[PDB]
Amino acid sequence: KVFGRCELAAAMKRHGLDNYRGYSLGNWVCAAKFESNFNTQATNRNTDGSTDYGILQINSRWWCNDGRTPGSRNLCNIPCSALLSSDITASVNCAKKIVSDGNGMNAWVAWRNRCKGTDVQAWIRGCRL
């Protein structure tokens, strides 16, 4: 499904992402917008054989297992198909593990490119949270 901006902000908040590891809610909403355009079913193939899955475009080489990626490490221990669900729970749980990995939100290229620095709070203004 395609989440509406405020609808997603409320779901990610309910799931403890506001200020998780030092990143305010807007950072996460901003990452979702440029990563998948709020679509839980987005997928994208990479030159190395991996695919990025879901609302947060979590990569199959290190994080989830899709059974077709050479060098798969499955560090969130989850099938990549669980990440395309309408329930963002599995994507959120795995993102909490990715961000804890000593680099933070730099794991998401769209985030470092389009969100890091800007007024990320704009992503949450006008919503009831």
PDB file of all heavy atoms in Angstrom, residues 53 59-60 63-69 72 74 77-81:
ATOM      1  N   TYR A  53      14.190  -3.946  -0.694  1.00  0.00           N
ATOM      2  CA  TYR A  53      12.783  -4.238  -0.461  1.00  0.00           C
ATOM      3  C   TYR A  53      12.044  -3.341   0.506  1.00  0.00           C
ATOM      4  O   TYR A  53      12.562  -2.959   1.557  1.00  0.00           O
ATOM      5  CB  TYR A  53      12.625  -5.674   0.074  1.00  0.00           C
ATOM      6  CG  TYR A  53      13.085  -6.775  -0.869  1.00  0.00           C
ATOM      7  CD1 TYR A  53      14.427  -7.186  -0.901  1.00  0.00           C
ATOM      8  CD2 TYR A  53      12.178  -7.417  -1.724  1.00  0.00           C
ATOM      9  CE1 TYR A  53      14.854  -8.212  -1.769  1.00  0.00           C
ATOM     10  CE2 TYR A  53      12.590  -8.432  -2.579  1.00  0.00           C
ATOM     11  CZ  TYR A  53      13.926  -8.821  -2.596  1.00  0.00           C
ATOM     12  OH  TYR A  53      14.344  -9.819  -3.434  1.00  0.00           O
ATOM     13  N   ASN A  59      18.238  -3.838   1.799  1.00  0.00           N
ATOM     14  CA  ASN A  59      19.050  -4.666   0.900  1.00  0.00           C
ATOM     15  C   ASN A  59      19.219  -6.156   1.255  1.00  0.00           C
ATOM     16  O   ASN A  59      19.530  -6.512   2.389  1.00  0.00           O
ATOM     17  CB  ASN A  59      20.405  -3.955   0.725  1.00  0.00           C
ATOM     18  CG  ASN A  59      21.268  -4.549  -0.377  1.00  0.00           C
ATOM     19  OD1 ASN A  59      22.115  -5.386  -0.110  1.00  0.00           O
ATOM     20  ND2 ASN A  59      21.077  -4.096  -1.608  1.00  0.00           N
ATOM     21  N   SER A  60      19.055  -7.021   0.252  1.00  0.00           N
ATOM     22  CA  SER A  60      19.162  -8.481   0.401  1.00  0.00           C
ATOM     23  C   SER A  60      20.569  -9.059   0.583  1.00  0.00           C
ATOM     24  O   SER A  60      20.727 -10.252   0.887  1.00  0.00           O
ATOM     25  CB  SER A  60      18.527  -9.153  -0.809  1.00  0.00           C
ATOM     26  OG  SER A  60      19.259  -8.834  -1.990  1.00  0.00           O
ATOM     27  N   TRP A  63      20.919  -7.764   4.821  1.00  0.00           N
ATOM     28  CA  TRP A  63      19.868  -7.787   5.808  1.00  0.00           C
ATOM     29  C   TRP A  63      18.751  -8.792   5.836  1.00  0.00           C
ATOM     30  O   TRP A  63      18.336  -9.206   6.925  1.00  0.00           O
ATOM     31  CB  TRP A  63      19.295  -6.363   5.952  1.00  0.00           C
ATOM     32  CG  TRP A  63      20.341  -5.281   6.078  1.00  0.00           C
ATOM     33  CD1 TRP A  63      20.721  -4.410   5.111  1.00  0.00           C
ATOM     34  CD2 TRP A  63      21.193  -5.029   7.199  1.00  0.00           C
ATOM     35  NE1 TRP A  63      21.755  -3.635   5.549  1.00  0.00           N
ATOM     36  CE2 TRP A  63      22.076  -3.996   6.826  1.00  0.00           C
ATOM     37  CE3 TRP A  63      21.308  -5.589   8.485  1.00  0.00           C
ATOM     38  CZ2 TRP A  63      23.063  -3.509   7.684  1.00  0.00           C
ATOM     39  CZ3 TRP A  63      22.274  -5.101   9.330  1.00  0.00           C
ATOM     40  CH2 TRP A  63      23.147  -4.075   8.926  1.00  0.00           C
ATOM     41  N   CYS A  64      18.182  -9.107   4.684  1.00  0.00           N
ATOM     42  CA  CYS A  64      17.102 -10.069   4.660  1.00  0.00           C
ATOM     43  C   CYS A  64      17.513 -11.115   3.628  1.00  0.00           C
ATOM     44  O   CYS A  64      18.443 -10.909   2.833  1.00  0.00           O
ATOM     45  CB  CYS A  64      15.790  -9.414   4.263  1.00  0.00           C
ATOM     46  SG  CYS A  64      15.880  -8.607   2.618  1.00  0.00           S
ATOM     47  N   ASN A  65      16.850 -12.257   3.657  1.00  0.00           N
ATOM     48  CA  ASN A  65      17.186 -13.303   2.709  1.00  0.00           C
ATOM     49  C   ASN A  65      16.113 -13.481   1.629  1.00  0.00           C
ATOM     50  O   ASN A  65      14.915 -13.605   1.939  1.00  0.00           O
ATOM     51  CB  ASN A  65      17.424 -14.626   3.446  1.00  0.00           C
ATOM     52  CG  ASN A  65      17.486 -15.809   2.488  1.00  0.00           C
ATOM     53  OD1 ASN A  65      18.288 -15.832   1.545  1.00  0.00           O
ATOM     54  ND2 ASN A  65      16.585 -16.747   2.684  1.00  0.00           N
ATOM     55  N   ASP A  66      16.528 -13.378   0.368  1.00  0.00           N
ATOM     56  CA  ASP A  66      15.588 -13.572  -0.738  1.00  0.00           C
ATOM     57  C   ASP A  66      15.914 -14.815  -1.568  1.00  0.00           C
ATOM     58  O   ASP A  66      15.313 -15.048  -2.611  1.00  0.00           O
ATOM     59  CB  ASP A  66      15.407 -12.309  -1.614  1.00  0.00           C
ATOM     60  CG  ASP A  66      16.615 -11.963  -2.509  1.00  0.00           C
ATOM     61  OD1 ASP A  66      17.680 -12.650  -2.548  1.00  0.00           O
ATOM     62  OD2 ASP A  66      16.456 -10.948  -3.217  1.00  0.00           O
ATOM     63  N   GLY A  67      16.923 -15.555  -1.103  1.00  0.00           N
ATOM     64  CA  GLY A  67      17.339 -16.809  -1.721  1.00  0.00           C
ATOM     65  C   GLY A  67      17.988 -16.758  -3.077  1.00  0.00           C
ATOM     66  O   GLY A  67      18.343 -17.798  -3.611  1.00  0.00           O
ATOM     67  N   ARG A  68      18.157 -15.562  -3.633  1.00  0.00           N
ATOM     68  CA  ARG A  68      18.780 -15.415  -4.943  1.00  0.00           C
ATOM     69  C   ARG A  68      19.933 -14.438  -4.945  1.00  0.00           C
ATOM     70  O   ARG A  68      20.472 -14.128  -6.002  1.00  0.00           O
ATOM     71  CB  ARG A  68      17.767 -15.034  -6.051  1.00  0.00           C
ATOM     72  CG  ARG A  68      16.690 -14.005  -5.687  1.00  0.00           C
ATOM     73  CD  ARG A  68      16.166 -13.234  -6.891  1.00  0.00           C
ATOM     74  NE  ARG A  68      17.114 -12.186  -7.273  1.00  0.00           N
ATOM     75  CZ  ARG A  68      17.929 -12.231  -8.333  1.00  0.00           C
ATOM     76  NH1 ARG A  68      17.911 -13.268  -9.171  1.00  0.00           N
ATOM     77  NH2 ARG A  68      18.861 -11.294  -8.491  1.00  0.00           N
ATOM     78  N   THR A  69      20.359 -14.009  -3.763  1.00  0.00           N
ATOM     79  CA  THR A  69      21.455 -13.053  -3.691  1.00  0.00           C
ATOM     80  C   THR A  69      22.786 -13.671  -3.291  1.00  0.00           C
ATOM     81  O   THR A  69      22.927 -14.191  -2.176  1.00  0.00           O
ATOM     82  CB  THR A  69      21.134 -11.869  -2.721  1.00  0.00           C
ATOM     83  OG1 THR A  69      19.894 -11.264  -3.125  1.00  0.00           O
ATOM     84  CG2 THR A  69      22.254 -10.831  -2.731  1.00  0.00           C
ATOM     85  N   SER A  72      24.703 -13.444   0.503  1.00  0.00           N
ATOM     86  CA  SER A  72      23.689 -13.087   1.474  1.00  0.00           C
ATOM     87  C   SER A  72      24.130 -13.362   2.938  1.00  0.00           C
ATOM     88  O   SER A  72      24.615 -14.460   3.258  1.00  0.00           O
ATOM     89  CB  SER A  72      22.409 -13.849   1.102  1.00  0.00           C
ATOM     90  OG  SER A  72      21.445 -13.899   2.147  1.00  0.00           O
ATOM     91  N   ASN A  74      21.943 -12.163   5.761  1.00  0.00           N
ATOM     92  CA  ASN A  74      20.696 -12.156   6.564  1.00  0.00           C
ATOM     93  C   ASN A  74      20.846 -11.711   8.034  1.00  0.00           C
ATOM     94  O   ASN A  74      20.481 -12.468   8.941  1.00  0.00           O
ATOM     95  CB  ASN A  74      20.044 -13.553   6.506  1.00  0.00           C
ATOM     96  CG  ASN A  74      18.533 -13.545   6.836  1.00  0.00           C
ATOM     97  OD1 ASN A  74      17.913 -12.504   7.006  1.00  0.00           O
ATOM     98  ND2 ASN A  74      17.944 -14.731   6.898  1.00  0.00           N
ATOM     99  N   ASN A  77      17.702 -11.362  10.117  1.00  0.00           N
ATOM    100  CA  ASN A  77      17.137 -12.719  10.121  1.00  0.00           C
ATOM    101  C   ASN A  77      15.689 -12.737   9.699  1.00  0.00           C
ATOM    102  O   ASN A  77      14.827 -13.168  10.454  1.00  0.00           O
ATOM    103  CB  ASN A  77      17.281 -13.346  11.512  1.00  0.00           C
ATOM    104  CG  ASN A  77      17.054 -14.842  11.507  1.00  0.00           C
ATOM    105  OD1 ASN A  77      16.340 -15.368  12.363  1.00  0.00           O
ATOM    106  ND2 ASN A  77      17.695 -15.549  10.563  1.00  0.00           N
ATOM    107  N   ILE A  78      15.404 -12.363   8.461  1.00  0.00           N
ATOM    108  CA  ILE A  78      14.019 -12.312   8.031  1.00  0.00           C
ATOM    109  C   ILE A  78      13.887 -12.538   6.505  1.00  0.00           C
ATOM    110  O   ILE A  78      14.851 -12.310   5.755  1.00  0.00           O
ATOM    111  CB  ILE A  78      13.443 -10.921   8.470  1.00  0.00           C
ATOM    112  CG1 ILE A  78      11.923 -10.921   8.427  1.00  0.00           C
ATOM    113  CG2 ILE A  78      14.069  -9.747   7.634  1.00  0.00           C
ATOM    114  CD1 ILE A  78      11.285 -11.166   9.761  1.00  0.00           C
ATOM    115  N   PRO A  79      12.782 -13.158   6.045  1.00  0.00           N
ATOM    116  CA  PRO A  79      12.706 -13.323   4.599  1.00  0.00           C
ATOM    117  C   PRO A  79      12.419 -11.953   4.020  1.00  0.00           C
ATOM    118  O   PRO A  79      11.669 -11.178   4.631  1.00  0.00           O
ATOM    119  CB  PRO A  79      11.527 -14.305   4.405  1.00  0.00           C
ATOM    120  CG  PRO A  79      10.768 -14.212   5.654  1.00  0.00           C
ATOM    121  CD  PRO A  79      11.825 -14.064   6.700  1.00  0.00           C
ATOM    122  N   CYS A  80      13.040 -11.620   2.892  1.00  0.00           N
ATOM    123  CA  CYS A  80      12.795 -10.303   2.302  1.00  0.00           C
ATOM    124  C   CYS A  80      11.329 -10.077   1.975  1.00  0.00           C
ATOM    125  O   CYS A  80      10.882  -8.944   1.972  1.00  0.00           O
ATOM    126  CB  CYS A  80      13.635 -10.036   1.054  1.00  0.00           C
ATOM    127  SG  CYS A  80      15.442 -10.043   1.275  1.00  0.00           S
ATOM    128  N   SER A  81      10.561 -11.131   1.725  1.00  0.00           N
ATOM    129  CA  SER A  81       9.130 -10.968   1.406  1.00  0.00           C
ATOM    130  C   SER A  81       8.311 -10.413   2.580  1.00  0.00           C
ATOM    131  O   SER A  81       7.228  -9.876   2.369  1.00  0.00           O
ATOM    132  CB  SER A  81       8.537 -12.304   0.983  1.00  0.00           C
ATOM    133  OG  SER A  81       8.854 -13.289   1.957  1.00  0.00           O
TER     134      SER A  81
END
